[PDB]
């Protein structure tokens, strides 16, 4: 809900905009009486010329009622039914300001509404004379199917007029580009005019054209190389992070205790939140700006006088600010300096930076050791794949199985030997 402050501000701003006036808040608040009526009257005079009234010399009661019928019926606003027309006859701000607010808000609807009101309605003639002579009845049939034409082509025109965009900005861009091209062709005319007296003309220009293309490919390759290198490094780092997450997952799986897990999670969340709230965005921003300023230093030519003047100006300004912060450290009424809390915050700050870097060093060694664990896990998996060794109690069971195989073959061997000795005794029984 808007305070009467906000409402008055809105009313003054939009009354100033629509009527191109420059009322101040006091000056507008000063407008009571018929003058405020004529303010609203001029709002409606921007919507319909028929509504343009001079309230200075007009029957204020009948004209105010005419206005009210306009605002209620055509524009479509209603409310305190018994008091509204009587108090609206009066220039009562408690009734007028909400009406000004409503009209200055829905201004586009007021436009459309008055358009239709001019065109659509104000016929309810009985059919008596219409049934008397069919000539004007056919004239009225002409009128009503003209109104049908009107609603058909109007909704079609309005939907298509909103559908297609305004080519003003586009023609502006096109003309700017044409002017840019014309300027460039002039610049080139100057260039090739300065290059007329060269010893070998197309020879040198083709050589330089080739050199230039070489230099541009050089620089693009340099940049894509740097990009690919860093993007590697970062994808590596994300792997290391994944491993850290895995370590924390097994440690947290140790204590099924959700609560303690969430306590340690929150402690690391805020340790990250420490560097992600300001320190890293500040370093990021400073690097972004430093790079942008060097790109602009290489793209343009240098007038080192401008930057040397910015240098001296900053030197003097920092002199002012240092002396000012110094005189802020002058002892107050107590004899107490601000510097006492400055030394307390310095001391705590050094403690925090010291502990925080201890933390990161530990974290570095964990990630390092943790990479190495993956390295060893990998080569052990490579060996367990390239071979299928056992080297355990499985080795002993395998070895017992092979020994049993040896004994089993020897058993089968004596089986065939016995069968063969019976074959031999059969051959000798045959010999008889």
């Amino acid at each position: 809900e808007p305070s009467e402050e906000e409402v008055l501000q809105y009313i003054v701003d939009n009354v100033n905009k629509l009527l191109s006036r420059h009322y101040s808040l006091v000056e507008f608040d000063a407008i009571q009486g018929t003058d405020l009526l004529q303010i609203l009257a001029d709002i409606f005079g921007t919507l319909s010329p028929a509504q343009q009234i001079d309230m200075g010399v007009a029957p204020t009661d009948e004209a105010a009622a005419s206005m009210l019928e306009f605002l209620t019926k055509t524009l479509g606003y209603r409310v305190l039914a018994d008091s509204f027309p009587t108090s609206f006859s009066r220039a009562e701000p408690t009734v007028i300001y909400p009406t000004l607010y409503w009209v200055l808000s829905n201004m586009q609807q007021n436009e459309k509404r008055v358009y239709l009101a001019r065109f659509l309605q104000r016929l309810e003639i009985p059919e008596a004379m219409l049934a008397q002579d069919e000539d004007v009845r056919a004239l009225y049939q002409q009128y009503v199917n003209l109104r049908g034409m009107f609603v058909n082509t109007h909704r079609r025109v309005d939907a298509l007029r909103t559908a297609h965009a305004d080519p003003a900005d586009a023609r502006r861009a096109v003309t700017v580009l044409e002017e840019e091209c014309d300027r460039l062709r002039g610049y080139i005319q100057v260039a090739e005019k300065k290059l007329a007296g060269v010893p070998d003309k197309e020879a040198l220009l083709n050589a330089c054209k080739s050199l230039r293309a070489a230099l541009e490919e050089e620089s693009r390759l340099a940049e894509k190389g740097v990009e690919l290198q860093q993007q590697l490094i970062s994808s590596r780092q994300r792997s290391t992070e994944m491993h850290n997450r895995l370590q924390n997952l097994r440690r947290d799986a140790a204590d099924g205790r959700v609560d303690v897990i969430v306590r340690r999670l929150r402690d690391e969340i805020q340790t990250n939140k420490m560097i992600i709230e300001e320190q890293l965005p500040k370093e990021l921003q400073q690097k972004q700006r430093e790079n942008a300023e060097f790109d602009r230093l290489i793209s343009e030519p240098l007038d080192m006088q401008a930057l040397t003047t910015e240098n001296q100006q900053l030197d003097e300004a920092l002199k002012k600010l240092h002396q000012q912060v110094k005189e802020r450290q002058k002892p107050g009424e107590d004899g107490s300096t601000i510097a006492t809390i400055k030394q307390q915050v310095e001391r705590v700050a050094k403690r925090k930076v010291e502990v925080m870097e201890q933390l990161t060093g530990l974290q570095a060694d964990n990630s390092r050791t943790l990479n190495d664990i993956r390295e060893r896990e990998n080569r052990i998996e490579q060996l367990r794949e390239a071979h299928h060794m056992l080297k355990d109690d499985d080795f002993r069971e395998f070895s017992k199985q092979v020994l049993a195989k040896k004994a089993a073959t020897e058993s089968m061997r004596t089986h065939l030997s016995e069968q063969r000795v019976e074959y031999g005794v059969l051959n000798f029984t045959e010999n008889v």
């Binding site: 340099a222 940049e223 890293l280 060097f294």
Partner: protein, 306 residues
Amino acid sequence: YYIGLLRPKITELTTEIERLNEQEELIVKGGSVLTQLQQRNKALTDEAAKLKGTLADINLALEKSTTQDPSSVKDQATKLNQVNGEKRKQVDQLFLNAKEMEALTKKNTQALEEEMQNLDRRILAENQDFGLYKATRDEAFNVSDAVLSHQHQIRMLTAKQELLMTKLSTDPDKKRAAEVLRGILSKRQLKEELTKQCALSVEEERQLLIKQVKTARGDIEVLERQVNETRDALSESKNRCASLDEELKSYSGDNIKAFQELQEKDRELQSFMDSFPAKLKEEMDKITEVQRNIATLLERISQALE
């Protein structure tokens, strides 16, 4: 008395009909104009690029004309072209390496996601507050991702800046100008900070500093807890690392071949076993044949007597 009222309303209405249809025709013509201007704008942008190109070509020619001739310039060019070809190869190797690394990170991340799923199913079964675990975990991961993102962006910026610095070492004038602009940037930042400081009342400044020391002391507390927690994880990791490389002791040297030789002996014996059964059946049938021939000799001699 009403016909003189129909007439003017009818003509006014038709006049607005005419206006509306003229506006329709205008909207269509404007549409085709916009479609034409898009193509014209693209064509002009490209021609502008080309015009900038030949302008740059001529200006490089103007530079090199004083000190070089077409021969030396084209030599510089082909030299740089050969270098760019080798560089093209280096950069494509980098492309490949990075694509691999990224693929590995994707597999590591899918792996970790699987173990997360099994643990979170485990705690959900145990009927603990799973929603809180998932929530604080998602927050933790998001802030971490945030830190990794920022650190990536800073490393990137710094490397490209090193490129810019090398480019500015071409001209000693722009080199000294670049270092001076570096100082300008630092001084701008210091002015910003000092102006922030002096714009508050010393009472407001001490209030802010007191709040700052409070929050700093709380941060130091949470930092010391983290230091202990990672000392614990670090100890854990070092024991896992020694544990693993001693697990690796058991594959080195003779051990692998010793198992290989036992494998080979296994395969020898199984081949010999598989060789046994068919030959057993064959020798069996041979022995039955010779005993059948025993019967043949005996009964033939018996039949001789009859």
